[PDB]
């Protein structure tokens, strides 16, 4: 058009404004300067208003004291770049220094005074940005703390100093305490929050005092904690700030807190969908060598990088084929999508792994040009070292001189080039993505043009097998007359037979040479990325390595110490760190494979780290490592990660006690001794505190049923009693024995019997009679045939069969590992020979079976009081096979929606069950000892019947010397017994329920341990009635206030799962035990029903002193009182991470079988074959034998306060 472009520029570079925002505010001006300028001044406003319908949740915090009078307020503008951007600060700084000097408490005073100039970035940015509340402090003595900037203190305090303020404002910062201390609570907020606990806690039947000194109890730590008072002071936690303060001379008059984008919802967004659906009106209008780039957008708000990922999709749609990430093709490439709205955010998922990049595509609307904003943009780029930038000028359409694009571009050229991109060789399109949605052909080459530079400028990324040989050490093994090998997954390159190779990594680096390569099933003669294998060394001793160490081509790789690194930290909702840490830290680094422990230094003017925040940091390792910049780590404490990040940059490199740890070693060994039965002297003064009459004979520990009636409380204690001491094994008081477990074994045997007769015969001589049982083995027949399969698969019988677990038939408890179970040759049976030499034929390490025969071991393990539990130790080459099919059936059971691994889905029905009363759950006695064979075969595919039969121990050997031929098909201990029974007993249980409309999805089950609808219960119980099974009708629950299933007990919905005291107790880590069992089943939430803690506190005396107050938080183990962390004078806080000791199981090393342990290792690889985001950098660890001395140990753990 007629006004020219030269000259708008001249504008343009005086205001700040759009480029159509000035060449058409001039054309008005007849092409007048000064007059467009002013006509803009006052036609923004409008903008700015136009704004303010836009959620603006990011911004900056500003805090400055004088003297002793502070002031803190946050402008917030709707993206983290504007936060940290050239101008924005320079505005929230001004706002804040005129508050200051002229104080201003009242918040529309400033944000009038100010709305003009506001007006002034709002049109400049293109952003809503708005003032925000401001507040301000003065006291004797007053500090601040600026965390970054996305979140301020100001602390005043009448009575301490410099050093003490900025602490306990960097407490404030990391603690968010609402009150000053525990008295300010709000005399009515706190009037009816315990007005209303005190029903929580009195309708679930407790008495009134309980639940008022309960509830009281709860109250005062409920306030406590949110009171600056009493919370545990955040550089010296095992002190709370209330002391802290008291111990100095000093008091604080009080704090302000203001974090950026408190209060403010912004609803989330989800860019994945936001596109797709953006474009679903313009929707409605052998090569797999190919490399996977991705790319990301980045730019204004609404320039539109939103409506071009759009259209990049689209017209590579209508042009060619096929974490929140968009993708889309390029005949030649695949690419991966994401955007980048904001800095900070990004740099965390490019820390996190969770989305890298190799070019990133900067999107500015031509319409505007570059924003002030824009040079963050770029400058985020140049931080994160992404390689390439190709820019995409949008909405052009709209610029009606063509002099005025080849200036936009001059604009953006150069930004580019002050951080040190190529600005004049960078490609730059110029075309609108709003027009190539319209199915525009003129403006939709653009977009292929785009695509065609995302083809042609950012590189291929080198493909893992191209770069040098590296293989992460996971375990050494020597090798009789074959010599050492290290196991590993080759991360990248290729290692053929005969090369030479290094092992550097935490010794002086040494080189060495590949004698060989091989998997467990193949043997190779070269090793090739990404691959399991085992790797043979010559001349290399098996000590003179470790898990940590690379193998890699030589001179590839180098050791080192010291780097500086960037790092997230996770937060806590991420299972991080709760608490913030400081200058010492001293975590322990996973690099690939290992912990190696180190130290860090902060950079130039941070002190503190917070659980959520970026970071970089220089690290510097104890002991070196393999690395080069580019190498991701764990960052460790304890074993639970708190923190991600990498290696930026390689530099040159450069508590515990005696009498402590031996002090509570000496009381751990010691022997806890008293009169009498220590166990029913508890349970007793536990009944006692609960107004319940005591045992009077051990007699009656054990024979003493609930009532199932009473409140929720008064039944929890009654159903205590009637469990605590069920499973004690050793009462003396009873002509009682193991025999009684035999007599029993021999009982299903002999039913197991009339069940295959009976089975076996069922012609009534007419055609009247019909039976339910006849009709549901009939109807479960052909569910399962349905589920199951005709045969088991191989590609199923090959992923799952393994070793693993206790004795075999030639393996005592003590060689129970999987490593001696491919060491010693296991036995196996004559059915399953074949099964054996199958493997056999399949991998070439000697597969060796020991004797041969159709045997296994019943025997006997103790159980209860009043009866042993018989079990069967099979062949172990039998076992591998029926933990094959046992595995099968537990991902087949998966659609029936039984999940066997989680017994937590059946803890939830009972629940419900006791509450909704619809849901019965029932109990079987025998079960694992009463499937006949008939009933299998009845109900089993005949192919899947036959390899059950072969897998099967046919015969059994007694300890008695005697044998028996198994009436039942399997016992426990078989590898597929519990997945069989699991399958018989829900397809039985669904026929029943289709047998009476009900839904075959309400009966759910693990094991013998059944969940379905109460109707179907009397119509179950005689169907199993028919097919042998016996029904527990005491531990069936159809209709009662009560149901349990795998472990949880449940009344009404309240939880009454009771605790047992199995063993006599006679050592401290025993009574540890008790009490803490007691501990939880009587807390609510750290806060004692005063009725058991009395006796808590009674027997706690029992134990050594040290031991008394040795303590630690929950989910941590029982060797140690559960308690509080903070109270415990022994926990050592190490480097911001604090170590607790506890009792500690003594053991002594043994001698692994190095073959054995290396074919388990290799059959494992191979399994795994056949299969926050930071469980990708670990691994599973090597094998290391020890037998249990009855000895103690002392070890120290890490721990947090929660
Ligand atoms: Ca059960």
Not at 137 to 157: P, W
Not at 450 to 473: N, Q, T, V
Not at 893 to 914: F, K, M, P, V, Y
Request: charged share 25%.
């Amino acid at each position: 058009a007629e006004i020219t472009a030269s000259l708008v520029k001249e504008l343009r570079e005086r205001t700040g404004a759009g480029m159509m925002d000035c060449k058409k505010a001039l054309t008005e001006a007849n092409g007048d300067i000064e007059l467009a300028i002013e006509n803009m001044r006052k036609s923004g406003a409008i903008k700015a208003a136009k704004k303010a319908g836009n959620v603006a949740a990011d911004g900056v915090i500003k805090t400055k004291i004088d003297g002793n009078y502070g002031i803190i307020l946050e402008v917030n503008c709707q993206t983290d770049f504007v936060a940290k951007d050239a101008g924005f600060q320079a505005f929230a700084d001004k706002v804040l220094d005129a508050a200051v000097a002229g104080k201003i408490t009242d918040v529309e005073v400033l944000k009038a005074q100010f709305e003009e100039e506001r007006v002034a970035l709002v049109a400049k940015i293109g952003e809503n940005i708005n003032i925000r509340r401001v507040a301000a402090l003065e006291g004797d003595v007053l500090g601040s703390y600026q965390h970054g900037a996305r979140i301020g203190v100001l602390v005043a305090a009448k009575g301490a100093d410099e050093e003490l303020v900025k602490h306990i404002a960097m407490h404030v910062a990391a603690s968010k305490p609402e009150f000053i201390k525990p008295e300010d609570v709000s005399a009515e907020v706190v009037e009816k929050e315990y007005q209303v606990q005190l029903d929580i806690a009195m309708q679930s039947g407790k008495p009134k005092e309980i639940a008022e000194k309960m509830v009281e109890g709860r109250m005062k730590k409920f306030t406590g904690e949110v009171s600056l008072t009493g919370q545990p002071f955040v550089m010296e936690p095992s002190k709370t700030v209330g002391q802290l303060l008291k111990e100095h001379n000093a008091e604080v008059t009080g704090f302000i807190r203001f974090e950026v984008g408190e209060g403010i919802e912004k609803v989330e967004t989800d860019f994945a969908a936001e596109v797709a659906a953006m474009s679903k009106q313009s929707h409605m209008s052998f090569e797999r060598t190919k490399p996977h780039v991705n790319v990301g957008t980045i730019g204004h708000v609404d320039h539109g990088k939103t409506t071009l990922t759009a259209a990049i999709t689209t017209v590579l749609a209508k042009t060619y084929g096929g974490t929140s990430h968009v993708e889309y093709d390029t005949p030649t490439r695949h690419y991966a999508h994401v955007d980048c709205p904001g800095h900070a955010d990004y740099v965390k998922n490019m820390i996190t792994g969770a989305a890298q990049m190799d070019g990133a595509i900067l999107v500015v609307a031509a319409t505007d040009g570059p924003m002030p904003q824009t040079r963050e943009h770029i400058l985020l780029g140049r931080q994160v070292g992404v390689p390439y930038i190709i820019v995409f000028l949008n909405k052009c359409d709209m610029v009606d001189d063509e002099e005025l694009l080849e200036l936009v571009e001059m604009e953006v050229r150069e930004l580019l080039s002050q951080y040190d991109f190529p600005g004049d060789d960078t490609p730059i399109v110029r075309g609108s993505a709003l027009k190539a949605l319209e199915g525009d052909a003129e403006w939709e080459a653009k977009i292929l043009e785009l695509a065609g530079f995302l083809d042609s400028y950012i590189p291929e990324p080198e493909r893992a097998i191209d770069k040098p040989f590296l293989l992460p050490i996971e375990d050494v093994f020597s090798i009789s007359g074959r010599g050492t090998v290290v196991t590993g997954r080759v991360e990248r390159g290729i290692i053929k037979v005969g090369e030479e190779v290094e092992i550097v990594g935490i010794k002086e680096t040494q080189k060495s040479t590949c004698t060989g390569v091989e998997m467990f099933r193949k043997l190779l003669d070269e090793g090739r990325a990404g691959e399991n294998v085992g790797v043979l060394l010559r001349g290399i001793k098996r000590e003179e390595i470790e898990r940590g160490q690379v193998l890699a081509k030589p001179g590839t790789i180098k050791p080192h110490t010291k780097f500086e690194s960037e790092v997230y930290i996770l937060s806590k909702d991420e299972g991080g760190r709760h608490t913030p840490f400081f200058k010492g830290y001293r975590p322990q680094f996973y690099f690939r494979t290992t912990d190696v422990t180190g130290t860090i230094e902060l950079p130039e003017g941070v002190e503190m780290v917070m659980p959520g925040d970026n970071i970089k940091m220089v690290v510097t390792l104890i002991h070196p490592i393999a690395m080069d910049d580019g190498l991701r780590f764990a960052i460790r404490e304890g074993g639970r990660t708190v923190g991600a990040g990498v290696v930026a940059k390689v530099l040159s490199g450069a508590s515990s006690r005696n009498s402590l740890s031996a002090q509570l070693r000496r009381a751990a060994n010691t022997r806890i001794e008293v009169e009498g039965n220590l166990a029913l002297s508890i349970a007793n003064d536990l009944l006692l505190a609960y107004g319940q009459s005591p045992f009077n004979s051990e007699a009656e520990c054990i024979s003493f049923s609930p009532r199932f009636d009473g409140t929720p409380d008064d039944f929890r204690i009654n159903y205590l009693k009637a469990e605590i001491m069920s499973k004690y094994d050793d009462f003396s008081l009873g002509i009682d024995t193991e025999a009684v477990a035999w007599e029993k074994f021999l009982a299903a045997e002999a039913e197991c019997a009339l069940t295959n007769a009976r089975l076996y015969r069922p012609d009534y001589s007419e055609d009247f009679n019909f039976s339910l049982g006849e009709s549901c083995i009939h109807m479960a027949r052909r569910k399962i045939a349905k589920l199951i399969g005709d045969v088991p698969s191989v590609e199923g019988m090959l992923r799952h069969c393994r070793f693993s677990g206790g004795a075999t038939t030639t393996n005592n408890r003590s060689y129970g590992h999987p490593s001696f179970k491919f060491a010693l040759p296991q036995a196996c049976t004559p059915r399953a020979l074949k099964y054996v030499l199958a493997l056999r034929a399949s991998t070439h390490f000697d597969i060796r079976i020991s004797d041969i025969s159709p045997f296994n071991k019943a025997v006997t393990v103790p159980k209860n009081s009043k009866t042993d539990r018989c079990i069967a130790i099979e062949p172990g080459w039998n076992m591998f096979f029926q933990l094959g099919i046992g595995g099968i059936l537990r991902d087949r059971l998966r659609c029936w929606g039984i999940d066997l691994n989680d017994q937590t889905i059946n803890q939830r029905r009972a629940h419900e069950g006791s509450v909704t009363n619809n849901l019965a759950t029932v109990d079987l006695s025998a079960a694992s000892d009463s499937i006949s064979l008939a009933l299998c075969e009845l109900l089993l595919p005949p192919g899947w019947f036959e390899v059950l039969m072969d897998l099967r121990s046919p015969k059994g050997r007694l300890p008695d010397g005697s044998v028996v031929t198994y009436e039942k098909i399997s016992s426990m201990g078989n590898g597929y017994t519990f997945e069989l029974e699991s399958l018989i007993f829900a397809s039985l249980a669904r026929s029943v329920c289709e047998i009476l409309d009900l839904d075959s999805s309400e009966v759910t089950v693990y094991g013998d341990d059944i969940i379905l609808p109460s109707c179907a219960v009397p119509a179950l119980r005689e169907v199993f009635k028919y097919v042998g099974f016996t029904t527990n009708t005491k531990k069936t629950f159809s209709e009662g206030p009560f149901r349990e299933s795998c472990g949880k007990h449940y009344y009404s919905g309240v939880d009454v799962t009771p605790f047992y005291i199995r063993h006599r107790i006679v050592s401290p880590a025993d009574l540890i035990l008790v009490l803490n069992n007691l501990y939880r089943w009587a807390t609510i939430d750290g806060v004692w029903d005063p009725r058991a803690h009395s006796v808590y506190l009674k027997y706690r005396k029992l134990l050594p002193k040290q031991l008394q107050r040795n303590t630690i938080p929950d989910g941590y183990g029982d060797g140690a009182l559960v308690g509080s962390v903070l109270i415990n004078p022994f926990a050592k806080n190490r480097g911001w991470i604090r170590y607790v000791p506890v009792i500690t199981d003594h053991t002594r090393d043994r001698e692994r079988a190095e073959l054995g342990s290396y074919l388990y290792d290799l059959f494992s690889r191979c399994l795994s074959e056949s299969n926050a985001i930071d469980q990708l950098i670990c691994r599973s660890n090597p094998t290391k034998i020890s037998r249990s001395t009855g000895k103690f140990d002392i070890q120290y753990i890490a721990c947090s306060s929660r």
